[PDB]
Amino acid sequence: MSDIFDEAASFRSYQSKLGRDGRASAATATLTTKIRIFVPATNSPELRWELTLFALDVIRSPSAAESMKIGAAFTLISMYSERPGALIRSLLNDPDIEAVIIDVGSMLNGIPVMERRGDKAQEEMEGLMRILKTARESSKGKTPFVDSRAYGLRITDMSTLVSAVITIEAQIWILIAKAVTAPDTAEESETRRWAKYVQQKRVNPFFALTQQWLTEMRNLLSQSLSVRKFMVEILMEVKKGGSAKGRAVEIISDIGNYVEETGMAGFFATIRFGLETRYPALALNEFQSDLNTIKGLMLLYREIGPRAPYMVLLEESIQTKFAPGGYPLLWSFAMGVATTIDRSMGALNINRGYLEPMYFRLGQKSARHHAGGIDQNMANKLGLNSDQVAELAA
Amino acid sequence: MSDIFDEAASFRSYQSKLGRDGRASAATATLTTKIRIFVPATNSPELRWELTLFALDVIRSPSAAESMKIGAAFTLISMYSERPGALIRSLLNDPDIEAVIIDVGSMLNGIPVMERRGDKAQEEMEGLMRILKTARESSKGKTPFVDSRAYGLRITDMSTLVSAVITIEAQIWILIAKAVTAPDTAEESETRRWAKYVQQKRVNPFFALTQQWLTEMRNLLSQSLSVRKFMVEILMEVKKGGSAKGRAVEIISDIGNYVEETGMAGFFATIRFGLETRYPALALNEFQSDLNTIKGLMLLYREIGPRAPYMVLLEESIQTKFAPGGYPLLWSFAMGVATTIDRSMGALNINRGYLEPMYFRLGQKSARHHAGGIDQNMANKLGLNSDQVAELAA
Amino acid sequence: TIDRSMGALNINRGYLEPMYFRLGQKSARHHAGGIDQNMANKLGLNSD
């Protein structure tokens, strides 16, 4: 009767937020791995420039352990800040890892430990020379930068160091957008992002890392979740306005615009195209289930918090509930109108196992062959009967 | 008269929750079996790696007693946690078994009990040696891992131990989804999950157990209810958000996303297809009793609690009431409409004794030949008669 | 007529009243479709 078809509406709503309540215990505590991070102790450009040159080699090194690679990645990302140690410690929310911040101090060819020389210090020094030698020998004499003069470059001016650092920072931050969604199909948008900043003169193109190095870093960035968690945390904190933003932060925030809502195009295309742009072909006894699920998903996205857009980057388990497959019918209809309306929509890979071509065809017809689609008009267009015909005349 | 057909509805509602009230006594207390669990006392990677290798061997062993196999399974599942004993003790709700947590301490080829050597210890040592020898001899020299180098592999880095343990836990946790529903028809969805996690780089494919070991572990998991209860409790605790989630916890929750509502495809398919997607063929005076039963089942499911999705895993007696057989007509109608609508639905085995082919045919017709089926339109589609005709044309 | 399993039940009692049994048999199939009160308004359901 009347009561039924409404009990389920609450039942499906209740089923979504079934056990997602309360607080968990500390028993489920992940084992932690020690991560050694080399941060510059001082503000001297010569030390910082020599440090970021070292961090580039460690990432490019094939003999480097993964823990060292994470430390080099953390060293690079926090190079812009005047207090890299404070930034890492106050913006780390990774239960998987524990970070031991190491102030570099002075700077040799490698790094001087400068702590009880001879006692548990020489072996680390030999290891770093093995890291540096293997890193340089692995490549065919090719420096990480696309310009060989950018590697053996002496930096003593603070102005030059800052510009050089951002270019290394910016080129790294391009990769996060398509590091886990489709890392193989990258280097097209990444080059487009780099070209945009070069034309804006925000980045000096002299310090341009080669694509061989970028592939090595992107592979490291995709494998490791701790680096992604730290980099997402920076994005969220920078996104919060209120204070003055420096050149380093402004580029990071600008890059974060492309990073947001990544890896969830299937869900958002359904929202933008399938749900909005109201087509008379919506209520057809086969979308009401998907419409109800989509409505529940909106509340879940609002409930998650500020980490919702970067769900794929953090690999949240809640993301699977958002993926198409729980509402394949409306999603198939949604990309049916999406491919016809948006020219860019159509390069998306949607060769899933629940394509439902019949509903895809209906979406294709809905964009063009359905009707003109005049929604409720606040302005009274009493003589616009032919106006729709002229619009429909194409 | 008017009172009839409402008195009957209240009677059925009261009969559903007939005697499920009050609190039971302690007289009906099951006999408990001692279960010996070997947990790592320290955090040294070598000891934990040796312990998980021993657990793999014991599980693979054919001469192992069932209690030893359950102990090995509990040892494996809790290896990721830094304090496995606390995790097991604080997440155990099994009246059938009592767990005696044993801190391993040091590690020989097997495990040193290190408690009054010579007194009631040498027999256990020789028993464990027999277990290991039988496990190694039983297979044709084949290690549990698909790579022979992964077995005799020395682990001293914490990161490598974490990665290997994560891979082993993931491969174990794939089996729970289809361990009791259809264990024989597995190895397809399990392989799909493994491929998905490999493509996400969450699991290192080097530590991939062979399919023979996976079959043995799936058989053990299907036979035993205590392991299933422990893993369902872990899933429930992990599902509760609020705290930071590690890589192991994220993987476990992502797997539990697939685990939820397993073994109840008939009921939920009935809901989603027959109940929702309102078809003019619903109100037919042969579905009213089924609709009332379905409503009562919905209230029962809401009443059960957070264990409602995992009733088949825990083998709850309430599950039999949820199974089709109390509402075969609406279930058959929903199966027909689902098979016509959902392409994936149709690989389901529905060769029951209450198929009612007439209602299956009625649902098949209602899916396609019935009508366009335009529901209540909030947006007024004045001229959408031709739109409905075109939609029905397909 | 409705439940296939129902029919293995032994109902050979002394008060069978076949005339009312026959009417029940006709009620399931030959009586009518039996459209009950419809919360959803299906105006075009005459052919349905």
Side-chain angles (χ1 to χ4, degrees), chain A residues 1-22 24-113 118 120-383 390 393-394, chain B residues 1-22 24-113 118 120-383 390 393-394, chain C residues 1-44:
Chain A
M1 42 177 28
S2 76
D3 192 352
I4 191 140
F5 311 117
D6 183 18
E7 272 276 343
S10 61
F11 166 80
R12 307 287 271 192
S13 85
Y14 153 81
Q15 192 180 9
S16 38
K17 335 158 281 184
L18 183 44
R20 333 197 64 88
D21 276 330
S25 159
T28 61
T30 318
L31 204 43
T32 60
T33 86
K34 272 180 50 55
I35 290 199
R36 268 188 156 234
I37 301 181
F38 281 114
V39 301
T42 62
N43 291 28
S44 59
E46 46 275 9
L47 204 143
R48 294 223 180 182
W49 175 239
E50 191 50 58
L51 193 36
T52 176
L53 280 199
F54 163 86
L56 257 55
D57 272 317
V58 171
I59 281 189
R60 192 191 55 181
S61 172
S63 100
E66 186 83 359
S67 93
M68 273 319 259
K69 295 240 221 170
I70 311 307
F74 273 66
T75 279
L76 280 182
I77 296 156
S78 68
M79 201 55 78
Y80 83 91
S81 199
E82 62 170 28
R83 295 282 133 201
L87 164 63
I88 299 171
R89 262 203 308 278
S90 267
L91 266 196
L92 204 58
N93 200 343
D94 309 45
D96 320 89
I97 72 172
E98 64 172 72
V100 54
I101 319 289
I102 302 169
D103 290 316
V104 159
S106 46
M107 201 85 208
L108 260 167
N109 301 336
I111 310 154
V113 157
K120 300 188 180 184
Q122 88 89 35
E123 48 263 64
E124 215 37 77
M125 259 75 97
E126 314 296 298
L128 294 170
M129 311 315 108
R130 298 198 285 286
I131 291 288
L132 268 277
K133 189 54 180 160
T134 50
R136 301 192 160 116
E137 291 310 313
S138 162
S139 201
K140 303 335 181 251
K142 175 75 216 83
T143 83
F145 306 97
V146 84
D147 215 356
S148 60
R149 320 198 304 259
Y151 191 70
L153 180 85
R154 176 61 138 197
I155 284 195
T156 66
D157 270 1
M158 181 64 87
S159 314
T160 75
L161 163 82
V162 169
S163 189
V165 157
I166 309 287
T167 53
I168 302 170
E169 301 305 282
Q171 273 174 283
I172 288 162
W173 280 88
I174 312 294
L175 317 182
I176 185 54
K178 288 178 181 176
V180 309
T181 74
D184 186 6
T185 88
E187 208 252 351
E188 200 282 326
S189 95
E190 297 177 354
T191 306
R192 181 144 66 235
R193 297 326 150 192
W194 173 250
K196 152 191 173 185
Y197 289 121
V198 166
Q199 216 268 316
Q200 292 210 293
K201 283 163 152 167
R202 304 172 88 161
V203 295
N204 162 235
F206 177 75
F207 307 93
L209 307 111
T210 184
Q211 202 61 41
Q212 282 83 308
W213 191 94
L214 291 194
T215 46
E216 300 190 35
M217 164 75 179
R218 193 172 47 232
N219 283 348
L220 154 80
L221 205 157
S222 188
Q223 287 157 26
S224 94
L225 171 60
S226 44
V227 156
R228 258 188 281 130
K229 282 227 198 89
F230 177 47
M231 281 202 345
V232 165
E233 279 276 1
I234 284 190
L235 282 181
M236 300 170 39
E237 183 89 342
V238 157
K239 191 182 194 286
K240 296 189 311 194
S243 162
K245 291 195 176 192
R247 195 167 306 108
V249 157
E250 290 277 54
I251 284 135
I252 285 171
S253 40
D254 203 275
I255 287 168
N257 277 353
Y258 306 130
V259 177
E260 288 187 43
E261 311 167 11
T262 189
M264 294 172 27
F267 167 64
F268 276 134
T270 303
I271 304 311
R272 154 74 176 288
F273 293 118
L275 186 79
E276 271 172 42
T277 73
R278 295 173 288 281
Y279 281 156
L282 228 52
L284 195 79
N285 305 162
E286 306 121 339
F287 296 154
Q288 303 277 2
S289 301
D290 288 21
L291 289 151
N292 212 312
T293 300
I294 277 289
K295 180 184 204 213
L297 277 200
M298 258 152 216
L299 268 296
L300 192 46
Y301 191 92
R302 184 186 273 98
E303 269 168 63
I304 288 154
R307 299 165 298 109
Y310 325 95
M311 261 168 27
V312 189
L313 292 200
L314 316 180
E315 305 211 307
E316 306 283 73
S317 44
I318 320 101
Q319 177 259 335
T320 291
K321 306 222 141 305
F322 274 76
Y327 45 82
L329 265 70
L330 176 60
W331 167 74
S332 285
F333 168 73
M335 332 274 309
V337 315
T339 52
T340 299
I341 284 299
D342 197 37
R343 161 199 309 101
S344 306
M345 281 265 168
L348 203 52
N349 197 348
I350 53 151
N351 57 358
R352 309 303 161 69
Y354 38 87
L355 201 37
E356 295 316 314
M358 171 85 258
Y359 293 77
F360 198 84
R361 293 179 221 230
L362 202 135
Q364 262 166 355
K365 308 291 219 327
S366 319
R368 41 193 219 282
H369 286 47
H370 193 4
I374 284 88
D375 176 331
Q376 215 286 315
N377 293 339
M378 201 274 267
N380 305 71
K381 283 151 270 266
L382 59 172
Chain B
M1 41 175 308
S2 77
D3 205 350
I4 296 283
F5 318 116
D6 190 356
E7 268 275 343
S10 61
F11 161 79
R12 306 286 269 192
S13 84
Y14 150 84
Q15 192 184 11
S16 40
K17 22 183 209 182
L18 180 46
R20 317 180 145 285
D21 279 331
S25 159
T28 59
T30 318
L31 205 45
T32 60
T33 82
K34 272 180 49 55
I35 290 200
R36 269 189 155 235
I37 302 180
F38 280 108
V39 301
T42 61
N43 292 28
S44 57
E46 47 275 9
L47 206 144
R48 260 138 188 277
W49 178 239
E50 195 52 56
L51 197 35
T52 176
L53 285 197
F54 163 86
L56 259 56
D57 270 320
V58 165
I59 273 180
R60 190 189 56 180
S61 171
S63 99
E66 185 82 0
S67 90
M68 291 315 307
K69 296 239 221 170
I70 311 309
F74 273 69
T75 283
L76 276 182
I77 295 158
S78 69
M79 191 75 38
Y80 84 92
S81 200
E82 62 171 27
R83 285 217 28 104
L87 164 64
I88 297 172
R89 261 203 307 278
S90 157
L91 268 197
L92 205 59
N93 200 343
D94 306 55
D96 321 270
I97 71 172
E98 65 172 72
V100 52
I101 320 290
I102 300 168
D103 289 315
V104 165
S106 46
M107 201 85 168
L108 262 168
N109 300 336
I111 292 96
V113 53
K120 302 187 180 184
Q122 79 89 16
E123 44 263 64
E124 201 63 61
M125 258 76 93
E126 321 306 300
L128 294 169
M129 301 325 108
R130 302 198 272 295
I131 290 289
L132 267 275
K133 188 54 178 161
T134 50
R136 297 193 157 116
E137 291 310 313
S138 160
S139 201
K140 299 334 166 261
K142 185 52 209 92
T143 82
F145 301 96
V146 83
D147 216 356
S148 62
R149 321 198 304 259
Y151 189 71
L153 179 86
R154 175 62 137 197
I155 283 194
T156 65
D157 269 2
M158 167 64 54
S159 314
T160 75
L161 162 82
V162 167
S163 189
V165 158
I166 284 316
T167 54
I168 299 172
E169 306 296 290
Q171 272 178 285
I172 287 160
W173 278 89
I174 317 304
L175 317 180
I176 184 54
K178 289 180 181 177
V180 309
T181 73
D184 191 3
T185 88
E187 209 254 353
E188 202 282 327
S189 96
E190 298 178 354
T191 306
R192 181 142 65 235
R193 300 327 151 190
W194 174 248
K196 153 193 174 186
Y197 284 123
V198 165
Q199 215 270 316
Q200 291 208 291
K201 282 162 152 168
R202 305 173 89 161
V203 294
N204 159 236
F206 176 75
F207 303 92
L209 309 112
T210 186
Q211 202 62 42
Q212 300 174 334
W213 191 95
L214 287 194
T215 49
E216 300 190 33
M217 171 85 158
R218 195 170 45 234
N219 286 348
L220 156 81
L221 207 147
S222 188
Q223 286 158 27
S224 95
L225 172 60
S226 44
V227 156
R228 256 191 281 130
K229 283 227 198 88
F230 180 48
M231 301 205 326
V232 165
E233 280 276 3
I234 283 192
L235 281 180
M236 291 175 38
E237 183 87 342
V238 159
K239 190 182 195 285
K240 297 189 311 194
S243 162
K245 290 197 174 192
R247 199 165 304 107
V249 161
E250 293 276 55
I251 286 200
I252 286 171
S253 40
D254 208 299
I255 287 165
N257 271 353
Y258 302 132
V259 175
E260 287 184 42
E261 310 165 9
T262 191
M264 301 202 339
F267 166 63
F268 280 133
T270 300
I271 297 310
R272 149 75 175 287
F273 291 107
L275 181 122
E276 272 170 41
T277 74
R278 299 179 294 280
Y279 277 153
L282 226 38
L284 210 58
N285 277 344
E286 313 116 336
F287 290 154
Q288 305 281 359
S289 45
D290 282 23
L291 288 151
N292 211 312
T293 300
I294 274 289
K295 182 185 205 213
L297 278 202
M298 271 172 182
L299 296 323
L300 191 45
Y301 189 93
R302 182 187 269 98
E303 265 184 282
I304 287 154
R307 298 166 299 109
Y310 324 97
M311 300 179 348
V312 186
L313 292 199
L314 313 181
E315 308 213 310
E316 295 288 72
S317 43
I318 318 89
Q319 177 258 333
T320 293
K321 307 221 142 306
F322 274 76
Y327 44 87
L329 268 66
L330 177 59
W331 168 71
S332 287
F333 170 75
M335 300 311 326
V337 298
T339 36
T340 304
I341 284 300
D342 195 37
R343 161 201 308 101
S344 178
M345 191 85 78
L348 204 53
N349 214 302
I350 50 157
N351 58 359
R352 310 303 162 69
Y354 38 87
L355 192 31
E356 291 319 309
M358 171 86 258
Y359 288 75
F360 202 86
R361 294 180 222 231
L362 202 163
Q364 261 166 355
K365 304 291 217 327
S366 322
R368 41 191 219 282
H369 287 49
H370 203 16
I374 296 87
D375 303 333
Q376 213 284 312
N377 292 341
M378 202 275 267
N380 302 71
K381 296 146 232 297
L382 291 166
Chain C
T1 298
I2 284 300
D3 197 37
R4 162 201 309 100
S5 176
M6 270 275 196
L9 200 51
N10 204 342
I11 57 159
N12 58 357
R13 309 303 161 69
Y15 37 86
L16 213 29
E17 310 302 334
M19 172 85 249
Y20 294 75
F21 199 86
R22 291 179 221 230
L23 202 151
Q25 263 165 355
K26 309 290 218 327
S27 318
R29 42 190 222 282
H30 285 48
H31 174 126
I35 283 86
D36 194 328
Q37 216 286 313
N38 296 341
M39 196 269 254
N41 303 70
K42 293 149 293 278
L43 43 84

